[PDB]
Symmetry: D3
Subunit: 152 residues, 6 copies
């Protein structure tokens, strides 16, 4: 129930370009979270406008959609107790300048427009993002051998 919460994590074009895919996945594996879905893909503007629908009436929305469609991305779904919230703590503050050393953004990037990764900000939106990026078919259910040493 609580251990079955899921979040959407995506490596952005700059994360892929800078060779940080393996490193980012390692952080989540290490922590004990469970990989549920993963894929390498070039997001379409139609999909990005959906993903960024809330930036619609904000200045320079097109430039955001064009940047995000400027290279391949790595969408993922991780499962675990409090993964949405904990996953965001792990990524660090959205604005890299505010990210602490030890977090993904704090260790690997500098500017907010090139902040290498995305993570759902709430359970509700994680629910929305996952359904937008993956078919229920792409979500894999399995059981880790070490499950009992991770959760009581």
């Amino acid at each position: 129930a609580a251990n079955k919460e899921r979040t959407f994590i995506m490596v952005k074009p700059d994360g892929v370009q800078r060779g940080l895919v393996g490193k980012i996945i390692e952080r989540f594996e290490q922590k004990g979270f469970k990989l549920v879905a993963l894929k390498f893909t070039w997001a379409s503007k139609e999909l990005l406008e959906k993903h960024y629908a809330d930036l619609s009436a904000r200045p320079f929305f097109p430039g955001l959609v064009n940047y995000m469609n400027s290279g391949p991305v790595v969408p993922m779904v991780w499962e675990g107790l409090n993964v949405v919230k904990t996953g965001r703590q792990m990524l660090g503050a959205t604005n890299p300048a505010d990210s602490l050393p030890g977090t993904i953004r704090g260790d690997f990037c500098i500017q907010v427009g090139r902040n290498i990764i995305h993570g759902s900000d709430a359970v509700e939106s994680a629910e929305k993002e996952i359904a937008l990026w993956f078919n229920e078919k792409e979500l894999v259910t399995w059981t880790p051998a070490a499950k009992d040493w991770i959760y009581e």
Copy 2:
């Protein structure tokens, strides 16, 4: 075209269960190789027997297909000059016992039946494997920013 050679690499169920996905991906990214495709999935037996078609007459063929259908896998495609042969060197000998330290199998596993990873043995087999596991829609073509620093 030389630098465009592609090979199929797959993290087996034991690799996923032991949390080695990011580490394996990282070895390829740091080397200079280009990720072309990636997904997390549970392989069906019908797909496994195709993938294993060559071992059809083998007495261990049934248990093999059986084992590979016992947990999720991470198939992927990497591109780069001579990647089939070099990808093989990186993985190390098929029997971990012969794999040298520094290789993936040599560093992370012990026995042949739990050798954490698969790699195409030749271009002709890489082509078949890639086509077996991926649809052409899933192979992403993009250009790494450091390409001229990797290849002349």
Copy 3:
């Protein structure tokens, strides 16, 4: 004197099971702390009940003892300026979800009941714990060659 303070650090059953022993010891070594004692053992309930004597009346007490007796543990002693306090900081908050990235619990575990490690909460309790877990003969006294580059 201040530099001779010691604390008791112990890898719990889940840390051993999840293969974090070397990683945890590494964190203390790279920091500059001196290893004073180390062993691998399966702790008896008698011993665990003395270690947890203060919680004897709690309703969870018996469950806690059975768990700590469910797998081997790695008890150790570290020495250095303010090691009890700094030791705690390096471990992170007891509840991993409150542990920040960069700490041992922040990077490697998720739930409080599976929080992989223990560290004395005070000089007083560290003294008590060391006496409980080790004999005088097990505490090694030596001098690090890098001593003058770690301390003024």
Copy 4:
């Protein structure tokens, strides 16, 4: 010009003696910061007192200059958006005791007098320090291939 800010970072004698030069450099490279200058040298006292001019009235000033002249150092300049302040965050609090895990001092050292590294505290001091330690001939101007993936 924003992204062209520069700060002075120096590996102190204890950092060199403890073999932390590559690790320190790696933290800056992975973050996205650009190396502008670097050298290995034994600093004279006359240079140290200039570098430490501000602490002239300090009772610990003499021993400080003394200590910093006791082994070789690795001065360097890094460039990047907001590098003075961010470089400071990365290093962690000046007193390692207050430095958090994840920072350089928090992860690698224990006491203030052996705090392995120096970082400019402000732009005005970075400018002076850079000019004190390096000749203009030694500051290299070049462009990283991934610049557009780090800054917009």
Copy 5:
């Protein structure tokens, strides 16, 4: 049975002094070998002379014993399929200069007289060494949760 083989691995005084304890243990853990015994101790000459009994007549014998008695050591027991032989492979050649990169000696040391680690040369000698260094009571028997993903 074949999987129950054990070997004796010991970190020498120089490995402890150079802070390689956690790194060395890490190599064995990530590989899949099971930790059976571990301790930190200062070895007596009496004990060292029994460990090196075969070299009693060599002219260097006394110098070797004095050196091995000059700092604490970390004796341990590892268990797994072909561990004595694979253990040796992971350590590299006795003389570090002949040790290949990726091995423990190849990556971390230089001269034969300061070769940081020891590993039994055969099943026969491993049995003898374990009895010399540990009591029956110090050998821990447990089952790794990942066992079925390491062995067929």
Copy 6:
């Protein structure tokens, strides 16, 4: 005498561009070798033609001089027992395709014209290269605290 042998190691333009400076230095520090000189610089064609004088009458010499003058390089001098020979083993085969995993080239690059690093091939040429790249002033003499644990 033998422990005082030195070699010239230089990170090439592609090594700097790919952010491998810290990593390469770490390998040498880790091994136990001693840093004697280090600097970040843009090599002049006049200096490169001297360095590559033996490629004079070979095809496409100019293209080599232009590539090597296409970005900053990191020249270094390391000191240690058999450092020239051992340093070359650590770098791996010149042609990356022949480099074994575990070596610098085997882990980080692909093609011979983009092989990230240079190392003197003999004591005689190390002697020549060092004098070409550094003034006797730039060579720092110091003594590591751990010297006695590295050499007998």
